[PDB]
Design a protein around this ligand. Structure first.
Ligand SMILES: Oc1ccc(Cc2nnc3ncc(-c4ccc(F)cc4)nn23)cc1
Length: 289
């Protein structure tokens, strides 16, 4: 039961650029297609009927938290790129927290897609998906947007098998609680096994730390969704990385692609490739297939 007048008017104006009237939106609350800490995601239809994904924020009840979440995420409306998840709009209403309306992703998240045994994506398919992610991240980096939670679970696949970098902006949540731990300097639930060494040490995130995460995502792709560092406790991830240890080469990962992964995990952030370079390198590797 959130009230508009309470929010900063500058934020209200920004939100009203993308507002969706309740009469234009039908939500199927019995059809859950995602689960987050802030609320579930439901099959919806946006009116001419469009199939969409409706992210609930009903678990966020405080106006100060709603304001902070909207403030941090609204920039999503200014992004436009085929490999970046877009915002369809925000449904405000007299009862309940704002609903975030997102495009429906027919093939769900990339991790479950590649783990599905009937799919059996080839090495070529998987490098192609990785290339798509790199292009989306190249775009976000060019907007100086730091993702902070890039991972295979957080990329979606639409009906044409276009990969959308996701779980950012107004879509931000923890959609698989298993892979977030408070065993870190911030005390907050963080994806510690996707995080760059310097982020674990200094609590700071940059595009270069997104690059580290992208390296882990490539490793997830080549292993068809195996969990990283299964034998490393969340207590030990920092010292593991300090010792110079890294994820091992996956059986079906091409040597040059593993070289790419290792570059992404260089201890010196400035030594790691840009997403622009990653697109060029992965494109070349992809093309040999
Ligand atoms: O068809 C859709 C379904 C959910 C959304 C929300 C969203 N935004 N960013 C996201 N990152 C990840 C997931 C997600 C992860 C694991 C899972 F089992 C399920 C989902 N979801 N999501 C968007 C469209």
């Amino acid at each position: 039961h959130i009230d508009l007048s309470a929010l900063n008017p500058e934020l209200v104006q920004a939100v009203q650029h993308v507002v969706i009237g309740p009469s234009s939106l039908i939500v199927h609350f019995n059809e859950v297609i995602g689960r987050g800490h802030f609320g579930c995601v439901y099959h919806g239809t946006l009116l001419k009927k469009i199939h969409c994904a409706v992210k609930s924020l009903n678990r966020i009840t405080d106006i100060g938290e709603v304001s902070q979440f909207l403030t941090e995420g609204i920039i999503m409306k200014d992004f436009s790129h085929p490999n970046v998840l877009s915002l369809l709009g925000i449904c405000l209403r007299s009862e309940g927290s704002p609903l975030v309306v997102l495009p429906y992703m027919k093939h769900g998240d990339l991790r479950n897609f590649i783990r599905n045994e009937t799919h059996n994506p080839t090495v070529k398919d998987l490098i192609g998906f990785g290339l798509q992610v790199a292009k989306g991240m190249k775009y976000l980096a060019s907007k100086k947007f730091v993702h902070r939670d890039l991972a295979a679970r957080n990329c979606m696949l639409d009906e044409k098998f276009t990969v959308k970098v996701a779980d950012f902006g107004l879509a931000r949540d923890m959609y698989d609680k298993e892979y977030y731990s408070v065993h870190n300097k911030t005390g907050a639930k963080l994806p510690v096994k996707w995080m760059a060494l310097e982020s674990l040490q200094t609590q700071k995130f940059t595009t270069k730390s997104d690059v580290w995460s992208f390296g882990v995502l490539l490793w997830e792709l080549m292993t068809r969704g195996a969990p990283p560092y299964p034998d490393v406790n969340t207590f030990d991830i920092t010292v593991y990385l300090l010792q110079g240890r890294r994820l091992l080469q996956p059986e079906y990962c091409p040597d040059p692609l593993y070289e790419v992964m290792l570059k992404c995990w260089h201890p010196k952030a400035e030594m790691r490739p840009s997403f622009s370079e990653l697109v060029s390198r992965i494109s070349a590797i992809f093309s040999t297939f």
